[PDB]
Amino acid sequence: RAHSSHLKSKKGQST
Amino acid sequence: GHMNSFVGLRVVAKWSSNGYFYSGKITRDVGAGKYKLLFDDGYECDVLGKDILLCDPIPLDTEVTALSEDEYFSAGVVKGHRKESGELYYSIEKEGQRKWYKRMAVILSLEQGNRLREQYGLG
Numbered sequence: 001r002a003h004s005s006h007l008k009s010k011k012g013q014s015t
Numbered sequence: 016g017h018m019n020s021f022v023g024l025r026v027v028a029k030w031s032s033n034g035y036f037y038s039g040k041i042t043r044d045v046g047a048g049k050y051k052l053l054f055d056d057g058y059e060c061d062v063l064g065k066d067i068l069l070c071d072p073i074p075l076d077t078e079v080t081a082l083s084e085d086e087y088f089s090a091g092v093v094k095g096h097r098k099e100s101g102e103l104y105y106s107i108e109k110e111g112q113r114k115w116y117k118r119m120a121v122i123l124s125l126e127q128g129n130r131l132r133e134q135y136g137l138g
Contacts, residue, residue: 004085006056007122010032015088 021050021069021137027123028052029066035080036068036128038119048138055119056084064138068128071135073105073118078127081107082120090124 021041028039039054048064073079073093080090091109105121106113
């Protein structure tokens, strides 16, 4: 296991 | 140890699919100017020297993306520095508040990172 997706700028992640 | 040719250095690098410049550690010179980068979030892809910034402690007054490591995304400006747990931190003034984020949470959107690629670019 690891932490979450962080940011992957290839798509939006709608904060 | 003190210095080595690329492999081992903490740097910032472009993630593929026209991504932002994320913090990472050079793992091996893949070849032809590609170096593989262990991004600080644990990910591993290859990146060309043109697209790696190796002398990039984020300057104060640089605009940056702040990234709560779970994913929350916003942008702001460096207006301070800290060292804690033997790791590097930045007071990002973000939404009119001074907020501590760490190197891998202080990333450079490609347009911002371009302003440093001209100097810190390996290639």
